[PDB]
Amino acid sequence: SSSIPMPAGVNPADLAAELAAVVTESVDEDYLLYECDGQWVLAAGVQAMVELDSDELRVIRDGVTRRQQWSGRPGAALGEAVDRLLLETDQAFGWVAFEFGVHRYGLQQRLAPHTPLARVFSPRTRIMVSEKEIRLFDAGIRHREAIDRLLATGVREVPQSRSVDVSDDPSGFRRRVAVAVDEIAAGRYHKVILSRCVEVPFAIDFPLTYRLGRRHNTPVRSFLLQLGGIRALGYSPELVTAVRADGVVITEPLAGTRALGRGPAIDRLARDDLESNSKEIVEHAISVRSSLEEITDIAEPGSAAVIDFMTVRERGSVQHLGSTIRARLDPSSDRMAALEALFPAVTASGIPKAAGVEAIFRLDECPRGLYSGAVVMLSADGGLDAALTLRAAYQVGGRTWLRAGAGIIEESEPEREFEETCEKLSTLTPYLVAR
Secondary structure, eight states, rough: OOOEEEEEEEOOHHHHHHHHHSSSSSSTTOOOEEEEETEEEEEEEEEEEEEEEESOOOEEEEEEEEEEESSSOOOHHHHEEEEEEEESSSSSEEEEGGGGGSGGGGGGSSTTTTEEEEEEEEEEEEEEEESSSEEEHHHHHGGGHHHHHHHHHOOOOOOOOOOOOOOOOTOOHHHHHHHHHHHHTTTTEEEEEEEEEOOOOOOBBBHHHHHHHHHOOOOOEEEHHHHHHHHHHHHEEEEEEEEEETTTTEOOOOOEEOOOOOHHHHHHHHHHHHOHHHHHHHHHHHHHHHHHHHHHHTTTOOOOOOEEEEEEEEEEEEEEEEEEEEEEEEETHHHHHHHSOOOOOGSSSSESSSHHHHHHHHHHSSTTTTSSEEEEEEEEOEEEEEEOOOOOEEEETTTEEEEEEEOOTTOOHHHHHHHHHHHHTTGGGGOOOOO
């Protein structure tokens, strides 16, 4: 409805991350900022919130809750609730937990009571931000003065970050990897993704940290949120599921990543390894095959295909190797069925998936929650965008932490894998802004 040209300097990411504080009608009002390749959407305030837990489904509106039992597949239950939410809003936002994908393997009985599966909400206001402009919608147009005020005074500057040590291994990651390798050697499964948490010994400013990190990470998707007691931010280069209004469904398993922008010789060496690494190539092939099979169960017959097989995508400080799998949703399926069909991401669980998920219940700190889960954006026209959450920071119940994993296979060395987790964490650890 209303628009404001984005000024000379003023980086969109910086303005978008600071918008919540000024449009937020009072308090620490919940919100979710979602970026889609340079296009930010801020969903500020909660009009209606849908909370799907392992044992209950709640709909909260203005402090009034509606509790009820749900049954069947979580995708069906969530889909029905979100479809009703979208009757009152053009877009809904939220996150889906790793645990959302365990029911399909008959492992939901292993979830403790009150395990969250999904949190989706209709916002009170939506603001879009791009390098070109700031767009306000409907009643949100009354935030024009506040936004103009912010641009007039300028956004808070970003202070220096505070370092954190990621070398300690309190959860025994190395030992857990040794256990997995043994199980794989025994033939119980081919691969499993195990992870470890790193506690941040000081409160961080999420909007500031998000902004600092966004100046060093340029993922196709990113997020910053404050929802139901959880603060989280992340940079997600992997799309676990995307459903378009026309029915096209896409998933993009990522094969591997290498640093970029360190000069010709170094960069080409890194790329050659990325495109020739037998280990990553084989695992990617297996992941692509897995995704094709999964998508085929919800697609129109003969519409599934692999587009851009093993292509390299350069994203500033890093370069990714991956593939895009595409299909057309079967007229008897739905976006939620598509999400659960590809959940949990094969790249963050294991192979066979059923065996991998089961191992994670035994060899990883559960519930994983947002980690290896997804942040989502749903549209009234049938659209769904789900970014896999891996490189992220969380704050819950007074605790702040990061989490990173590694794919474990028969030849994996616990020490090498521990080092891989350090490498991944390094995309966030140097940008933590305190307070």
